[PDB]
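Example: Retinol-binding protein 2.
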Amino acid sequence: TRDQNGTWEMESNENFEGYMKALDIDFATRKIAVRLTQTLVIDQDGDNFKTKTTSTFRNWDVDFTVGVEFDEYTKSLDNRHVKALVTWEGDVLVCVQKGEKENRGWKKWIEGDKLYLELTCGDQVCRQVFKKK
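Written out as structure tokens, the predicted fold is:
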């Protein structure tokens, strides 16, 4: 389904280390980032999304309109400039972050009662599963 509204609680986190290493996040930060407990909160109204990802490590927020390119300066992560665009491929929400890293972005989808998020950078994929709270 395309409705990703909800408050979403992480139940698994695979290869988050590999993903952050592929973004060149420094080692000491990676040890402390990485939380198996993480809340994703999504407000979706037509093409407008407001998302907030929360954890005892960091709180972060990003708002976007599907189909409207937006510049990002990822000062909270690897400190790069990317051009981001979020679009639907069927019921999979696809973000590509164009810039230095290849294959950078993410895909997000609802399957059954759960939210699946696949974060990509270079050759690395991080898979996260959330249950609806």
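The radius of gyration is 14 Å.
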